[PDB]
Enzyme design. Structure first.
Site, PDB file in Angstrom:
ATOM      1  N   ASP A  97       1.188  -0.959  -0.004  1.00 49.18           N
ATOM      2  CA  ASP A  97      -0.128   0.195   0.034  1.00 49.18           C
ATOM      3  C   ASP A  97       1.001   1.552  -0.196  1.00 49.18           C
ATOM      4  O   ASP A  97       2.012   0.984   0.263  1.00 49.18           O
ATOM      5  CB  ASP A  97      -0.690  -0.055   1.105  1.00 49.18           C
ATOM      6  CG  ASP A  97      -2.455   0.889   1.140  1.00 49.18           C
ATOM      7  OD1 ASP A  97      -2.561   0.560   1.962  1.00 49.18           O
ATOM      8  OD2 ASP A  97      -2.095   1.630   0.451  1.00 49.18           O
ATOM      9  N   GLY A  98       0.441   2.066  -0.937  1.00 50.72           N
ATOM     10  CA  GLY A  98       1.260   3.630  -0.114  1.00 50.72           C
ATOM     11  C   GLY A  98       0.541   4.822  -0.197  1.00 50.72           C
ATOM     12  O   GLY A  98      -1.115   4.599  -0.704  1.00 50.72           O
ATOM     13  N   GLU A 153       1.751   3.640  -4.411  1.00 52.18           N
ATOM     14  CA  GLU A 153       0.932   2.596  -4.661  1.00 52.18           C
ATOM     15  C   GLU A 153       2.147   2.003  -5.773  1.00 52.18           C
ATOM     16  O   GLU A 153       2.257   0.684  -4.902  1.00 52.18           O
ATOM     17  CB  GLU A 153      -0.061   3.073  -4.942  1.00 52.18           C
ATOM     18  CG  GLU A 153      -1.673   2.966  -4.044  1.00 52.18           C
ATOM     19  CD  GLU A 153      -2.198   3.189  -4.711  1.00 52.18           C
ATOM     20  OE1 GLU A 153      -2.840   3.674  -6.075  1.00 52.18           O
ATOM     21  OE2 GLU A 153      -3.490   4.804  -4.744  1.00 52.18           O
ATOM     22  N   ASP A 200      -5.018  -3.339  -2.280  1.00 51.28           N
ATOM     23  CA  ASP A 200      -6.381  -2.255  -3.181  1.00 51.28           C
ATOM     24  C   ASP A 200      -6.380  -1.239  -4.088  1.00 51.28           C
ATOM     25  O   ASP A 200      -6.846  -0.516  -3.590  1.00 51.28           O
ATOM     26  CB  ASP A 200      -6.857  -2.430  -1.626  1.00 51.28           C
ATOM     27  CG  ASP A 200      -6.249  -0.584  -1.109  1.00 51.28           C
ATOM     28  OD1 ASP A 200      -5.233  -0.553  -1.708  1.00 51.28           O
ATOM     29  OD2 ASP A 200      -6.618  -0.987   0.092  1.00 51.28           O
ATOM     30  N   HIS A 239     -10.660  -3.244   3.879  1.00 51.16           N
ATOM     31  CA  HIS A 239      -9.396  -3.935   5.547  1.00 51.16           C
ATOM     32  C   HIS A 239      -9.776  -4.826   6.019  1.00 51.16           C
ATOM     33  O   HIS A 239      -9.242  -5.753   6.717  1.00 51.16           O
ATOM     34  CB  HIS A 239      -8.794  -2.502   6.033  1.00 51.16           C
ATOM     35  CG  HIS A 239      -8.442  -1.530   5.300  1.00 51.16           C
ATOM     36  ND1 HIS A 239      -7.136  -2.490   4.500  1.00 51.16           N
ATOM     37  CD2 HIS A 239      -7.986  -0.421   5.188  1.00 51.16           C
ATOM     38  CE1 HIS A 239      -6.952  -0.855   4.122  1.00 51.16           C
ATOM     39  NE2 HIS A 239      -7.058   0.487   4.571  1.00 51.16           N
ATOM     40  N   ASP A 269      -0.993   0.476   5.093  1.00 50.97           N
ATOM     41  CA  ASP A 269      -1.369   1.507   5.235  1.00 50.97           C
ATOM     42  C   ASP A 269      -0.564   2.238   6.123  1.00 50.97           C
ATOM     43  O   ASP A 269      -0.603   3.734   5.998  1.00 50.97           O
ATOM     44  CB  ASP A 269      -2.963   1.233   4.867  1.00 50.97           C
ATOM     45  CG  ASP A 269      -3.423   2.704   4.677  1.00 50.97           C
ATOM     46  OD1 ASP A 269      -3.509   3.605   3.826  1.00 50.97           O
ATOM     47  OD2 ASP A 269      -4.959   3.059   6.135  1.00 50.97           O
TER      48      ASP A 269
END
Length: 155
Positions: free
Chosen positions: A10-11, A48, A70, A124, A134
């Site tokens: 995640d980013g 991301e 995601d 989540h 995250d």
């Protein structure tokens, strides 16, 4: 039997564009290794991608990878854009350059070195590792020590 690794990524940025960070978790045989970094100024999309790039580049040998994210941007790119970009020498029909081509090529290179099975998650709940990534990205974005030199601040 090929070595199997689970990667979660995640980013994001604190405001987009703005200070950003990524978070990745690499799990192999019950043991997890964390990856994170914060950049002075970048975008959600670049973070991301950077998350997946760094996790994949961490692999020292050819493995079977289950990559979970995601990110819609990464999802669409992998399943809808990269294919067309490559065939056109990385340039749309409108002759326009491909945004973040620097990270997209780096990711494509890393992906080609392993057998990947993408897992597109949306939420989540039921995805502990993703929420964790995250949290890692958000924390890193608060104290960025790196510069995203590939980020074209230009409009």
């Amino acid at each position: 039997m090929l070595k199997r690794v689970e990667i979660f990524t995640d980013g994001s940025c604190l405001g987009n564009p703005g200070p950003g960070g990524y978070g990745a978790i690499l799990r192999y045989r019950g043991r997890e290794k964390t990856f994170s970094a914060g950049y002075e100024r970048t975008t959600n999309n670049r973070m991301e991608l950077m998350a997946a790039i760094v996790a994949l580049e961490a692999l020292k040998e050819h493995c079977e990878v289950i990559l979970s994210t995601d990110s819609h941007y990464v999802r669409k790119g992998i399943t809808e854009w990269i294919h067309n970009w490559k065939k056109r020498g990385w340039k749309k029909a409108d002759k326009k350059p491909v945004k973040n081509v620097d990270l997209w090529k780096r990711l494509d290179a890393a992906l080609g070195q392993h057998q990947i099975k993408w897992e597109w998650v949306k939420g989540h709940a039921g995805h502990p590792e993703n929420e964790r990534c995250d949290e890692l990205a958000r924390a890193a974005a608060m104290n960025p020590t790196l510069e995203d030199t590939g980020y074209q601040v230009e409009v």
